[PDB]
Amino acid sequence: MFNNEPLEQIDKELHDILADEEKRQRETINLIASENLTNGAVRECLGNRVSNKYSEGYPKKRYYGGNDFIDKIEELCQKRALEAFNVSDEEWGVNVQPLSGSAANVQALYALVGVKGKIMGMHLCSGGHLTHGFFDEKKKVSITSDMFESKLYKCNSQGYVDLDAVREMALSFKPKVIICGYTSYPRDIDYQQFRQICDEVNAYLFADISHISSFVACNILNNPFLHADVVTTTTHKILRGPRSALIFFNKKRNPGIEQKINSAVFPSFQGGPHNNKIAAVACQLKEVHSPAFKEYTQQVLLNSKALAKALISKQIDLVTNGTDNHLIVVDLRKFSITGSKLQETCNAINVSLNKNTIPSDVDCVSPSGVRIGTPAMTTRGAKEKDMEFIADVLARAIKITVDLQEQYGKKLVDFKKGLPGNAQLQQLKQEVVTWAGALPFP
Amino acid sequence: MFNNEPLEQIDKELHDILADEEKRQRETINLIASENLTNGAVRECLGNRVSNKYSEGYPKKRYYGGNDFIDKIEELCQKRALEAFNVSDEEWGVNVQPLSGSAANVQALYALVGVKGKIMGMHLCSGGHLTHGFFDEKKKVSITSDMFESKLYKCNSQGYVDLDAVREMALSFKPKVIICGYTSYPRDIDYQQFRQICDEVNAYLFADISHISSFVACNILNNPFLHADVVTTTTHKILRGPRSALIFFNKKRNPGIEQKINSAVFPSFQGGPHNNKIAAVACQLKEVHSPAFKEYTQQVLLNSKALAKALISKQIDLVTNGTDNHLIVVDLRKFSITGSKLQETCNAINVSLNKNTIPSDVDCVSPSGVRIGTPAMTTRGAKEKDMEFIADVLARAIKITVDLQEQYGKKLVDFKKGLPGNAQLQQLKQEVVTWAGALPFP
Ligand SMILES: Cc1[nH]nc2c1[C@](c1cc(F)cc(-c3cccc(CCC(=O)O)c3)c1)(C(C)C)C(C#N)=C(N)O2
Ligand SMILES: Cc1[nH]nc2c1[C@](c1cc(F)cc(-c3cccc(CCC(=O)O)c3)c1)(C(C)C)C(C#N)=C(N)O2
Ligand SMILES: Cc1ncc(COP(=O)(O)O)c(CNCC(=O)O)c1O
């Protein structure tokens, strides 16, 4: 007693928007630093009937039965995770149930410190995440500033983590956790000096590596597993998995952390796991290990360096004047345009990027930069030589944005009136569409 | 720069476990009251490239551009949800972003009462959910007993909600929220008398309808939307959608509830929405509104009554001596077997059901019942006449469980040594596999 007609027949309305979404993805220069494109195999997992199964609890300790095959999938995913991130199943554990990155962070944080717990993380404006304790004078914007007592450290005027300030703050505040690992941070992290500061005040070291996961796994960047008590990561950004998260915990340094973290995920926060996610994650974690994927990850970095260099060659300023990873933040102050204006201009030419604060911004109200990254376009087959074109297109967008602001004014509502029908944008869009449309697409 | 080999080629190890899982689902009498089988259209959505898109925020107030198509899908989902549950978009709003039922409840609760907030819900042992404030002497098991202050009300000795005790507790405790709607409650709910008690103490009325959503939608059971401030529901149980949740809020009764609920979901708790889920939810909500799906839902209740009646005809006791909905709780005390023992016996014959507390159970440690329900089997085409066979199989399983317990003892470790190789269980398993394997399977 069910309708088994395919999606096109059963729901034509939805199926056209979805076909449109796909065409837009295929015809866009996607520079969102947090985005990627999943292969067909990962997407076969996500639509697999294994999502029909309720399996509350952990493998070999389920509430229900009929979880024999589900248990093999969850155990295969955990094994593959610890293998991908070069850790021994004796010293490190992993939970594979968190539904997304923000959930994983709130759960892991709760496990370590509990309600009223004291935490330290990077401010949102300086490249921190929302789940690192973000609040505002007006509101406790994240639950992590409300269910916990959070304090927020900043980057210096040049965009680097200011470790002297982390330490001065830690010694007066005395937190149980210090969060490092970030959302829009263009450089590698000194986990060792974080591990030193945490020892000095007796705090846990929490590394959110969601944006740089692949670099950590492939030994291209610093390894927080040498120093961290907890490592969290999403599986959907540079790692190229589905939308999910992973919480790692150091058993050796903290006996009794395994149960704390596991019980935080369930039953403290979640109910039934989504087994299609876990399947999809298992599938991707196999790829992550392969030497082919290390090639991909290296290519992401090569592309990012080349893109930084090309933008500098066109007299565009970058926060920290470069990058150690997949991401760049462009400082837009010398052109007198906001990030939101350039995001609008770039949307009109099928260039996906986001507005992003820079060190000089006191507030998140008017961000004076944009963030770009190479993982999506590296996935689609772009090499170092193609980064000049991307740098060319972004430079042209900045100029057009300056022209449009000149003609229609600095108010955003007034600015956007210039965008529709602009001859140069239609021209620039067409150049983007022709180049992006052709590229390999999973 | 990606591998596009199909799942079987790229990952043969995983594809075997998955095909095995599928075979077990196909060959099983699934009586888990919270499970169902999604159609092909819903699974096409879950595996759609729309999950590639980062779209933090809400439609027309996104952080990023490139979200024109995502905004249509999210707007279509909300529209179809208000329509499906017969509510006016003028009077009622809906958030479609929560990743799952437990998340939806923690988020909606936070929105209403904040940290340290006072909440009342049904005890887990009486049929409440974990996210309704469940704690123990030993631990605050759910976050909803820790980030909130919770008190728990019980059902009476006959298994019904005891309203006199709910008022008794509410007047002295004075919570800001009272939760009703349950995980293993076999009867309809008197939302009107909940509304009357909430008004008396100035508390919000929270209705979690995840198990009975379809009945509410199709006007077969009482309508909590006439009385409640907030209604939450999962989309994966009787509703037959993907794994996701919906939070409904009553604007008319509570102006400014829209923002608190929306801000609670993002950015307080979650980050990026899972657009594949939202697509999948849209797809199912269209089916939910059809007359064909009301026919399905009616069939679920017919099957449940017929199953209750056949179990009573075989001298098996049911909590409340019947059901108004899709679910039955069997009281096993007269056979002197635990729920876990019959759960094990039923797994051995490919019968999926769960152990479940009954009113006489003081603890959740040794539950004296099992819970069954008809949605899954009703989806697979089973009619009223087929319920006699299911009651026949369960009666035989109870007898074998009594036999095995006699032979091997009442310790669970000992009992299970009896299960493998049992001639009657192999015989009963084979009968289950022959009938279940034949039934329609989406
Ligand atoms: C959308 C989002 N999620 N997590 C982020 C962001 C970023 C962001 C950028 C931005 F311009 C604004 C925000 C933001 C998101 C939610 C709430 C707020 C508070 C400010 C307000 O309510 O106006 C700001 C957040 C970007 C990656 C998009 C961000 C920055 N800069 C950082 N560090 O992390
Ligand atoms: C697994 C689960 N999730 N939500 C539920 C359950 C149910 C359940 C049954 C059961 F036998 C035990 C539990 C349970 C789950 C988590 C923690 C606890 C505390 C007991 C302990 O730590 O041993 C009990 C929960 C069942 C629907 C499966 C339940 C009951 N009875 C109720 N009311 O709701
Ligand atoms: C450090 C960090 N942690 C967690 C998350 C996100 O978890 P969700 O799966 O809940 O979105 C992000 C992505 N932040 C958005 C971006 O970089 O574009 C992140 O940058």
Ligand SMILES: Cc1ncc(COP(=O)(O)O)c(CNCC(=O)O)c1O
């Ligand atoms: C009232 C209620 N609320 C929420 C949930 C579940 O939300 P998740 O999507 O987080 O599992 C359940 C399912 N409880 C398990 C069962 O009935 O089998 C439930 O019964």
Ligand SMILES: [Cl-]
């Ligand atoms: Cl999913």
